[PDB]
Write a protein that binds this DNA or RNA. Structure first.
Ligand SMILES: [Zn+2]
Ligand SMILES: [Zn+2]
Lengths: 222, 471
DNA sequence: CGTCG
DNA sequence: CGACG
């Protein structure tokens, strides 16, 4: 969708287009999406977070110009935002909402870390199945969606195509096929969902979540 | 079929055949949302001599250089066929043979490319006319040309062209029916798959603009007519000229140049032509009295009708073969509209300028053909603006669109009890009308009776005309 | 498969 | 689209 991309390296295998050295796994990396000459599709050109600013890319605003920014850890978002550079009720409520955002971010991340600590990939797949959720490709996305469901609830299927929705940077986009020819394009910040249900098998580890369900609701960018 | 030259083996080898099935596939994949417009070409090549076999893949974006290819030599023919079929099934989700193909999401769609005595005694004008309408060199050129802007991936079988035709009719039905935007997107994706377009690297647009849709429908109908003409050419001791004459099922005669009916025809042509929207003049060459087989019978119900008039019709010369074979025909109900303003029916004009503009003659072929028809109009339903009608009002036999210019009615002429509007172009007192020249329309094929057919040179006003006219 | 180009 | 862990 965007031009720039930022994420934690899903594999320690991509070579930086600047220093031509292996980018390690789970490390912060930034790509520029460039058209490919080999096939009809864009491809990410990956750089170490350091190398990326030495190529003179003048990113004005990361939160908007970079896809996947809204999904990084908080301190890493702050780092990317700083490096991209080198009225009472209004401002007061502004600061308070910022703190709430940090809360939700660090929350989801602690959840994902606990999960990866105790569960296996197949355990997470089973958690998704039990809650009537589609199992995506890639361990990262698997536990991302497990956390989404546990925080806000088992997403209910799409109203039209009947496919699962997934959270994107700005909204819950549907990922289903309205037909073999064209894909569905529903989006909404308020998707219907039933309550998340951990199978009883994982109860011993669900106390390893200490409940703490909370009544949170997804906070979306302005 | 053709060996893709990106393999460098079109002369060293040839595409392989087996079980009455060819091993060359051309698949398209489109998503207007993401903008993807991709092509995948797969071939199995066999050396013209030995048991040497190759698998050739190529892929990329239509009408661009984005993409790549790969050539593998296979150790045997069986391994090559397995490789081919498994690649096909990977890229399309279906098997290599199947009566019922089913589109699968994110998968490519297959495209149906189409590859590949002398004792006459007729008069010479008629022989030249037959040589004109049954011309094979021009037909084969127009059939299997190489225009990578209209056909970026080769000639399309008539089946797929009619499929896209019906898809466009459905698009128009939708736009009418307060449609879902997604109902339009599905048809847009399907169309742009069935008909590859060179859009460089821009996202293909939606079929919302109904005018461009009318245009694409006109293009597809032209291709269909050309396919029909080619299939008609492929119909001994008799001379080929008589052989092709017999296909017409029409009796042809040559009116004498110095005849009287001929001079009346010439006065018609001269008066009713207008150099205002036509950058050329008309010159008659040969007149032809035509009598179609059986058409003389189906018109009898209307010969006792009133207000029968002798009017013009003009189409490209390629179709004229068919036009004498099966008379004038109306469009089907499932076809879309291509620009006509008054529904599907037989159209005529009262001024040779208008009907001749529909010959689409070129400066390279100043010749064109044009028909004269006794059409039984009866009661005229007269309209000033477009109207896709279905039922004639109770009591009407035909429709007339009123332009701002018309032959002088005071100059009318009666030939065999048939009015002829050969007057000069004057202004009609019709206010607030959109047409420039009149249009006549009937909706029953039997209301037309072809009487004459003209060969005409379109003398264009180029440097040659400019010298001959300024000296 | 799930990465990467 | 292929290539590769
Ligand atoms: Zn680097
Ligand atoms: Zn949907």
């Amino acid at each position: 969708d965007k031009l720039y991309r930022v994420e934690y390296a899903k594999s320690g295998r991509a070579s930086c287009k600047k220093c031509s050295e292996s980018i390690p796994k789970d490390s912060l990396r930034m790509a520029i999406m460039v058209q490919s000459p080999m096939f009809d599709g864009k491809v990410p050109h990956w750089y170490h977070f350091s190398c990326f600013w030495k190529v003179g890319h003048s990113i004005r605003h990361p939160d908007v110009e970079v896809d996947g920014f809204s999904e990084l850890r908080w301190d890493d978002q702050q780092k990317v935002k700083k490096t991209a550079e080198a009225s009472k009720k209004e401002k007061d409520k502004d600061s308070k909402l910022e703190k709430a955002l940090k809360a939700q971010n660090d929350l989801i991340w602690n959840i994902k870390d606990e999960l990866k600590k105790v569960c296996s990939t197949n355990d997470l797949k089973e958690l998704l199945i039990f809650n009537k959720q589609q199992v995506p490709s890639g361990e990262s996305a698997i536990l991302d969606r497990v956390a989404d469901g546990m925080v806000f609830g088992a997403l209910l299927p799409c109203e039209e195509c009947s496919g699962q929705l997934v959270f994107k940077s700005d909204a819950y986009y549907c990922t289903g096929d309205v037909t073999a020819w064209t894909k569905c394009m529903v989006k909404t910040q308020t998707p219907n969902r039933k309550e998340w249900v951990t199978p009883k098998e994982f109860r011993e580890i669900s106390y390893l979540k200490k409940l703490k369900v909370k009544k949170q609701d997804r906070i979306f960018p302005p | 079929a053709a060996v893709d030259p990106d393999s460098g083996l079109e002369h060293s080898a040839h595409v392989l055949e087996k079980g009455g099935k060819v091993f060359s596939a051309t698949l398209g994949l489109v998503d207007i949302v993401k903008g993807t417009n991709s092509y995948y070409k797969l071939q199995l090549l066999e050396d013209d001599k030995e048991n040497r076999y190759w698998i050739f893949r190529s892929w990329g974006r239509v009408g661009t250089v984005i993409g790549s290819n790969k050539l593998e030599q296979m150790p045997s023919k069986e391994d090559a066929i397995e490789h081919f079929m498994k690649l096909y099934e990977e890229k399309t989700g279906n098997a290599w043979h199947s009566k019922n193909f089913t589109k699968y999401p994110k998968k490519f769609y297959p495209l149906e490319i189409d590859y590949g005595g002398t004792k006459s005694k007729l008069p010479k004008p008629v022989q030249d006319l037959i040589k004109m309408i049954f011309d094979v060199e021009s037909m084969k050129k127009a059939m299997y040309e190489i225009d990578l802007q209209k056909m970026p991936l080769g000639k399309l079988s008539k089946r797929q062209i009619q499929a896209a035709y019906s898809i466009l009719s459905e698009v128009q039905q939708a736009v009418s029916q307060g449609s879902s935007d997604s109902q339009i997107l599905d048809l847009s994706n399907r169309f742009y798959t069935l008909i590859p377009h060179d859009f460089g690297m821009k996202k293909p647009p939606l079929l919302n603009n109904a005018d461009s849709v009318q245009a694409k429908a006109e293009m597809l109908d032209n291709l269909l007519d050309i396919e029909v003409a080619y299939s008609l050419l492929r119909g001994s001791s008799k001379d080929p000229i008589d052989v092709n004459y017999e296909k017409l099922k029409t009796d042809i005669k040559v009116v004498d140049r110095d005849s009287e009916e001929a001079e009346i025809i010439r006065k018609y042509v001269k008066n009713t032509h207008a150099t205002t929207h036509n950058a050329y003049d008309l010159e008659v060459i040969d007149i032809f009295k035509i009598e179609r087989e059986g058409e003389c019978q189906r018109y009898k119900p209307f010969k006792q009708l009133h207000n029968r008039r002798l009017l013009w019709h003009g189409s490209r010369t390629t179709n004229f073969a068919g036009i004498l074979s099966q008379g004038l025909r109306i469009a089907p109900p499932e076809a879309p509209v291509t620009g006509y303003m008054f529904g599907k029916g037989i159209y005529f004009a009262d001024m040779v300028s208008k009907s001749a503009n529909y010959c689409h003659t070129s400066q390279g072929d100043p010749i064109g053909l044009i028909l004269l028809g006794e059409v039984a109009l009866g009661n005229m339903y007269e309209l000033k603006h477009a109207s896709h009608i279905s039922k004639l009002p109770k009591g009407k036999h035909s429709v007339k669109g009123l332009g701002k210019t018309t032959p002088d009615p005071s100059a009318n002429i009666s030939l065999d009890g048939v009015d002829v509007p050969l007057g000069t172009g004057i202004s009609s007192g019709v206010n607030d009308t959109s047409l420039l020249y009149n249009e006549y329309i009937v909706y029953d094929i039997a209301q037309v009776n072809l009487k004459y057919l003209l060969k005409l040179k379109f003398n264009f006003k180029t440097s040659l005309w400019l010298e001959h006219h300024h000296h």
